[PDB]
Symmetry: C4
């Protein structure tokens, strides 16, 4: 049965540890892939960790956009190894989600001026999208959002240090049935974290051009969209300035470059996942700002520590658990964090929102390099 | 279908070898986890070995309460390897059981003053329990007991060398529906081995404070509890004095510290699993005392050898096979023994009670260190 | 349910990347088989990569027609390893297909003067064919074609540098129900790539004797056959001359030896997969010739690059995805390419025909030898 | 559904290769168990290779009746590795079969004077048999035979160089319902290969005492037994004299010691599997003697080579494929051969009887030691 996607996110007061793979620590001895850009997506049975291999193992001489890059997947918490990974697609940029029946896998491969997204429904190639700007066609590196048998994603074509072109897709059974281009001047969308919420999709993305806060786009199933920036003075991107008065436009200070991130909108509130360090991808914390989606101030109410400030962090993205998997009446918000080491490789930790008691700690990668 | 849990333990005269993994012997060459505190729990289909990894492999430079510790599981008798282990939870103290529908996993992680138990039902986080004494919240390191769709566990918070606080939980579908604190002055409960028996639960635990006999707590589904010590002069803990006249207050002699153990109450009798050595965790034997639950004498009738006195042993715990798995009219009592080597790592052997003919032997770990 | 096989190939304008295993790159560190002659076949659930192991691993002292050669299989895109490969048959020449119910595996083993094909239906030996010329009995090294519960293959017995004997088989549930010998003087058929197309089978094969174009044989379910050569001046075999005027007979120039290949007939058109280099097995491209099946000219309309001319290629073969797997109204044409390295070992890439937008690139093996 | 076991063996004219694992060749690099005494048994879905591990891997310093010995199993043709083996029982002598519902596993462990057979039905301990002579209780090292939900085996207790005691068991759902002791003076039964045939069981065994021909015992489901020797002058055991006039008392010449073997009775005929060498366990051949079960002469009609005389062979045993697995009207006879290398370890090859065309060859282990 298709995931309905019509329930709301239920409110959460903290984040509870869900998975940790210990990939690099195991890969010091075992045969473990060199992976980058991991993300989590859940079927109505299980959650799976998706990752981009380089086609190489840790502690080997074979260890950005190469033809050897493939999207693979393992059960959540298991180490990514060639003996337990399932192949998904050839991809140096990827997205994947489950509509309640089968997996949809989106894999981008090809040259920088001619990249093509290959869409797979239950392992069968069902559609392709070619690059429309011929400057690095790229996608979420996180799970697409599925509402009522339609899955949705955001793709970006154009420069990563300037104005690019952003497209929203509706995908039914692996087939593109509607695409719209976002008219967003002075905005910049990269590597969006998208989640379903009451038949709507909300994406929170990376402004690599000139934004140290995070842009967002929300749209309905007919892809009528709204855009804006997260107005909180608690800035989400990395690099970023120290916390100050925010704005609902792109904040210029330390706005160049960035990191893939996420946020969860709760009315006017927002749960913000961000690095602890404002200069490097070090540490991770979750911050509850009861007015941060629209209000410019730098006052919050809850801060939970995820990764210690002296430990390496990286990409972070959102994923959801639908009521068809949990049996609840709401959609549970969850997120993953990539812990980048170094070769360059990464492990992953994942958290889910709960209303019960939580604690902060540091769950770092822990490999002795 | 939920496990009923209303049949009684059937009487057994001996213990028959069920599984042996040979973990360290294999891990000299293969990629095998460094594991500690293994335990066994059975679904209506199969039995599974649960274990705490350190996130490290044998014969590697990465080899108590760390954020890298995770609860994992393998089919019984198989070596714990990253290529065949299923991830369960992040945990440096754990418990797990199957109510007949899905697995319930309890995983404790966090700091010593702020640890939180994360409860998972079919891989979904369903509840959390925060520490109420802020001194190392800890649990069974063995299977919880499930009666009629409710699973039960005992948790301890407080000092391990003095009076602590002990709580009994009732858990339905991963949700705590009733918890009670045990009023047990001069008692000390650690790492309880709990089993169902005629709709009631019996736990036999470790007195780390001052007790060389083993404390016990029994309770019904509404958590009305009774407490006591095992009165037999055949003492169960390790370290322990030589066998003498017992009591069922806590026996002070060699009472400090201890080892996780188990016992099976049969009316007034008791099957006692214990180390052969009274000073170290060496050897293992099963002793049938027909009056040992209530009587203070040191006379028994059956002794079966499990591990030889010159071989290393360790933690031991109980698990059961419900009639829904065996097709019998009784609940079969079974137990595992951890064989600790050294890094510090452990293999496991497991036995099940039968009324047919048995033999004693030594089934040690066998790795040449 | 049996695959009907009665729909036609749907027209395609390009080829989209489907799988890439990165076998040798992984096998530099992991335990990966030394494999040769891989091919792909799909069940109504999944596609599988079949391969001939030498019974040896990469980077080992143990690394054509040996008794240690076995046919094995893995899920598509996964590395061929002894820990995830399924054993299929003992074979130094093989074919395999799925009729919609069970796998049919054909495995040839034995001496050069006495080889016997062993037919297996769902792992059970169901029939054998002995050699009728006693000079290396051999088969497709690609998937057999199944129409309406009957699977079809072509076998060759006799010299590979001269006139041999070619037989077409009809196989129902692993049992040979009809075989016919092809009366084909001056023709030479080796390692045929066969596909179903509207209840009929079309095979495109290798002329190792005197042909640099590719011979073909088409037949109905009663094995009434037609034969010919692909008339296009775009020659398909390797070694081959430079493109010139073709012929519907065997083209003598550079006609000796060859490589296993494929083609897809579309009325009078043909999709030709071939090496880029005319002298060695280097590179790969797909060429659309709208009249190439019957017309002798060297003019085409579409050329898509698959493997770069400086990268090693090898055997190529065809496979299909039936409507019972894709849910479409047509049979999707697909092909694989073996990338040969060096020991001698090979990885594999695979493509499927689509009518959407595609790009050319190079997806080579990538191992640093 | 239970296997009926009431059809007859259908006549076969040759033996076709079924599986070959290439264990030692792979284990030079990969993590492959050191195994001994492999055997094959088939469920109504699949066939499985059962083997006794030493709890040690090839190419490791950890590499007869030890407590570390365990019965494990893999799918047929796959290498025995800790990452794909299923644990079955603790055992230094074993037997296993499938009654059509679940696996029955028999595992003998314990000391030489106190060994106990542990019977497991679907992984649950269901019965035990203790040693009745206290001199190495031992069993088939091959598959038990199941007829109509009852599985049958032969066990031996007593000296291996003299008169011992032999018992036939009937086992229903893992429970012994009838055992009978064979009154067999001057006979010696070791490591019987038993097969069902028209609701009756026939076992062909090893005379380690004074017999170079092979003893046999046949019995119905009520264990009314008949005994004898194979009267053919084609002797089956190894060591053995050169072929001469036989008898069906025990043939004294070279009668001491032996090797586990098998034979298939076809009325008065017999298919004899035996080593080529009369002094060592070298080579293997299958010999059809149309009167060899009862007639003393040394004339046969068919000889098929299995393993070359310069290659190592070892234990050989029989297994069957029931009509519920093949869909045929008869029970297909099949056999395996262990190829012993050296540590001491072994690979396995397996053959099934067919009435189609076969060839002889050598399929040796092939590891370069
Ligand atoms: C700005 C997004 C994007 C623009 C192309 O770059 C991504 C890159 N994505 C791709 C498709 O290569 C990803 N592999 C990881 C990155 C990273 O670690 O920051 C980014 N790299 C740089 C140099 O910013
Ligand atoms: C007394 C129980 C408990 C009190 C905290 O200590 C456990 C410990 N449990 C935890 C939660 O760390 C466990 N890993 C193993 C132990 C062991 O091998 O004896 C114990 N260690 C010591 C120093 O006694
Ligand atoms: C001409 C086909 C065939 C004739 C016997 O030879 C095949 C060979 N097939 C067999 C059955 O051995 C295959 N392993 C690979 C080949 C290759 O890489 O070209 C061929 N080898 C040579 C020397 O041409
Ligand atoms: C005669 C059967 C039996 C009598 C005890 O001995 C078996 C042995 N079986 C057991 C139970 O150990 C088996 N592992 C392999 C043997 C072998 O390779 O020949 C035999 N060994 C010797 C010394 O003959
Ligand atoms: C979502 O829709 C389903 C039917 O599609 C309905 O049963 C359910 O109540 C809806 N839930 C909410 C929260 O609106
Ligand atoms: C346990 O309860 C079930 C119903 O829940 C009943 O059928 C069964 O007989 C009971 N068993 C015992 C041993 O009391
Ligand atoms: C193929 O046969 C089936 C019957 O199984 C029929 O329904 C189908 O329409 C046929 N295909 C075409 C293209 O007509
Ligand atoms: C075997 O038994 C089944 C029923 O158990 C019966 O249908 C079948 O005819 C029997 N076969 C023979 C050959 O007796
Ligand atoms: Ca930025
Ligand atoms: Ca104590
Ligand atoms: Ca040629
Ligand atoms: Ca003998």
């Amino acid at each position: 049965v298709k995931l309905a996607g019509n329930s709301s996110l239920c409110p959460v007061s903290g984040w509870a540890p869900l998975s940790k793979d210990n990939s690099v620590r195991i890969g010091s001895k075992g045969d473990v892939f060199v992976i980058r850009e991991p993300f989590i997506s859940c079927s109505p049975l299980e959650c799976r960790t998706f990752f981009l291999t380089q086609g190489a193992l840790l502690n080997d001489k074979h260890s950005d956009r190469s033809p050897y890059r493939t999207l693979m997947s393992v059960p959540i918490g298991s180490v990514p190894s060639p003996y337990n990974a399932r192949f998904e697609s050839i991809a140096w940029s990827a997205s994947a989600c489950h509509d309640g029946i089968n997996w949809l896998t989106i894999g981008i491969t090809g040259p920088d001026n001619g990249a093509v997204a290959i869409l797979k429904y239950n392992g069968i190639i069902t559609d392709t999208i070619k690059s429309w700007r011929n400057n690095i066609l790229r996608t979420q590196e996180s799970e697409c959002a599925c509402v009522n048998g339609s899955c949705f994603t955001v793709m970006t074509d154009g420069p990563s240090n300037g104005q690019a072109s952003y497209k929203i897709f509706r995908i039914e059974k692996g087939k593109i049935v509607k695409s719209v281009e976002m008219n967003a001047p002075n905005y910049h969308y990269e590597e969006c974290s998208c989640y379903p919420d009451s038949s709507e999709i909300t994406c929170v993305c990376r402004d690599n051009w000139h934004g140290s806060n995070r842009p967002w786009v929300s749209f309905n199933q007919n892809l009528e969209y709204q855009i804006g920036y997260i107005c909180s003075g608690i800035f989400g991107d990395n690099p970023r300035p120290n916390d100050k008065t925010g704005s609902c436009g792109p904040v210029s200070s330390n706005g160049a470059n960035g990191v893939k991130g996420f946020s969860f909108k709760y009315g006017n509130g927002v749960w913000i996942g961000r690095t602890k360090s404002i200069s490097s991808r070090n540490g991770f914390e979750m911050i509850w700002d009861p007015n941060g989606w629209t209000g410019t101030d730098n006052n919050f109410s809850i801060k939970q520590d995820i990764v210690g400030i002296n430990e390496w962090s990286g990409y972070s993205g959102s994923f959801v658990m639908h009521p068809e998997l949990t049996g609840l009446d709401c959609i549970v918000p969850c997120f993953w964090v990539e812990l980048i080491r170094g070769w360059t490789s990464g492990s992953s930790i994942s958290f889910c929102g709960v209303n019960s008691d939580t604690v902060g700690w540091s769950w770092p990668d822990g490999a002795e390099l």
